[PDB]
Amino acid sequence: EMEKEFEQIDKSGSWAAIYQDIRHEASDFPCRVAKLPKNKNRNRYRDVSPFDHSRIKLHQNDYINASLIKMEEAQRSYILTQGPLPNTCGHFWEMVWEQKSRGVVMLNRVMEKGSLKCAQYWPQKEEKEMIFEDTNLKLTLISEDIKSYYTVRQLELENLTTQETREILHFHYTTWPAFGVPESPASFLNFLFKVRESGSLSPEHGPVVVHCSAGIGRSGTFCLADTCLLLMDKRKDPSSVDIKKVLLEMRKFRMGLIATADQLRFSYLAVIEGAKFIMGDSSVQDQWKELSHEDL
């Protein structure tokens, strides 16, 4: 089916050739706001910026390194953003608020092979809530479900102005290395379906916010798999979804999505395995959970 094209590329060993092609064919749009001097300290990497046409605007300086990926045919939107900086934690939650997101998926760790990939932007203790005074927000850990390779936290975001509050679900994947891949499709798809079940992806909410270190590599992998599985179901045809065309479509909205040839391969592996659920084998989901060893 689609399992054809994968068995082929694996034998001929041409994954990097495929990946290099996407880099060549990918959109290239202006990033002028991101390159302004006043925004130098709001970008974590000098070669990773949001396109002007799809960048999120704070309702304030309105700049944040984050992009709205609006997949029209899949009928889902995501916001991909960089791991917040010490100075952009208030902007990040300002964004989450103004865009009405319900979920945040974080695929990196704050500490990653000695390198600091992210600021501690959410509170780790119920009793020590965070207050972001530049954006007038207050953030409180309410509860947390810790699993072997990921943690779900429940948070309360308070708009200190209006005093309204919202519940935000934080899904933190802790065993996904930079420029690397998850341990197995089951552990990934189990994670993805956890996020799906929470309702955080439902369209009555704003786009889910997805980030890693740069918001392009692991974040790209997570969003491509989810969208491919969405198109599988909508089109009602597994072997109809062409991962390459989908990834290029996502790259109209943010540069550099999917960071290694292996991450692209895993993307195929995950969509192929995920089709079992889409085709009707609704019970493969329980298989993924047991395979993922999420307990202890």
Binding site: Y45, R46, D47, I216, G256
Partner: peptide, 5 residues
């Protein structure tokens, strides 16, 4: 460094 490379 501070390049994604």
């Amino acid at each position: 460094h501070e390049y994604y490379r």
